[PDB]
Paper text:
To establish whether there are any minor conformational differences between the native and internal thioester variant proteins that could cause the reduction in adhesion (rather than just the loss of the internal thioester), we determined the crystal structure of the Spy0125-CTRCys426Ala variant. The structure shows that the overall fold of the variant is essentially identical to that of the native protein in the P212121 crystal form. The root mean square deviation (rmsd) between the Cα atoms of chain A of the Spy0125-CTRCys426Ala structure and chain B of the native is 0.65 Å. The Spy0125-CTRCys426Ala structure displays the same overall secondary structural elements, with slight differences only apparent in flexible loop regions. The electron density defining the position of Ala426 and Gln575 shows no link between these side chains, as expected. A small reorientation of the side chain of Gln575 results in a new hydrogen bond between the Gln575NE2 atom and the carbonyl O of Asn428. Tyr516, that is in close proximity to the internal thioester in the native structure is located in the same orientation, but no longer forms any hydrogen bonding interaction with these residues. The structure reveals that the only consequence of the Cys426Ala mutation on the protein is the removal of the internal thioester. There are no significant rearrangements in the overall protein fold that can explain the ∼75% loss of bacterial binding previously observed in the adhesion assay. Showing that the overall CD spectrum, proteolytic/thermal stability, and crystal structure of Spy0125-CTRCys426Ala are similar to wild-type protein provides additional, albeit indirect, evidence that the internal thioester has another function—most likely in mediating adhesion.
Numbering used by the authors: 290 to 319, 322 to 372, 377 to 719
Amino acid sequence: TTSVLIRKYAIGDYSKLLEGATLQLTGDNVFQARVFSSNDIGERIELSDGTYTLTELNSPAGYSIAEPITFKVEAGKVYTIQIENPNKEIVEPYSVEAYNDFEEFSVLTTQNYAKFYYAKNKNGSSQVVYAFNADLKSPPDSEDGGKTMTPDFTTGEVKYTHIAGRDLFKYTVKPRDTDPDTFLKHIKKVIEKGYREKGQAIEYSGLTETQLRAATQLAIYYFTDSAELDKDKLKDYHGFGDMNDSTLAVAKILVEYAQDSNPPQLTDLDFFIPNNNKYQSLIGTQWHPEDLVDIIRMEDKKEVIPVTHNLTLRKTVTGLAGDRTKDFHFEIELKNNKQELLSQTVKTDKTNLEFKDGKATINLKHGESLTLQGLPEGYSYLVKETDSEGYKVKVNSQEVANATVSKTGITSDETLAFENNKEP
């Protein structure tokens, strides 16, 4: 039976796992549902075949609650929606070494390439690897072929989590593609035709191993950082001015092959993510599935606009025939900044309010009010008083025939003062 780890990550920052999220895992077989706190390495569980569901009961301060993940365990494998689980990672994260071999020398034209990146395989050998982010820091310098590494000044030793390169789109900063799967194919085929191993046959006449590696790396950038393969535009671009014309031409051949319709011959590649977000993620040239186990990966959204707002409803009844102890009812529909219904709990000065598919219902009598709290920037409301029968209705002193009002793009606190009038 199947090993899984439940790991909580923050969208956009994978340098460590996101701790203190309250998580619940639910199934439907003979399996005991359980609650736990997301932690720095993952939650290890051994599971029988069946269908399970991970739910976030709530999130660390400053994060949205994520959508529940449903997955199925079958015959030692994990499936989700239907595909086979793409998240395969090592058990001790940020434990793999990668380094830039600071003492290796070989030029592009006039100047040492010096982007000689490697990750250490479990058995001690070194695989060639390539940067995925052209502006972040390279793997730590080693002066002795990867046996010792310069630490980072602030976070210390920089090590990496080894994952299967699937779903690599999210680590790109400025990619050309918009389809994740298309993107992945592009990447695997660049690697397919580029430099992978010491002493391999260089299909391209007159290039050194190092010049191919440079070509390969620039091709990756084409796709990951939208690098323009043009000698003019490259003059000052991370040392690629020193790239001669034929070496550049190969880089083009790699991009053009990858863009073509052939399936990738590579099924899978190692990928590495560093424990410092200013450093670059690395795409490997080899594939080592022995160490990788299934991860149920849930990604929490950083709360992007820390500013939140209040919305107050009031009821006042007037005229000689107005029932001051009638409960008037209000249907409230909220949509967020990006035009999406709110399926979440909401805080008030009284008891809390669950919103189901953008909606919720409250009531008030003459003199009662209710303040909603902590609604996002750019939110919009639609609010209706549902039982106005008999009463002339004004909202913020405006006659409102169908007892309904709306407002989009709200950048501050807002008030809806309903008047219910009934004269005899």
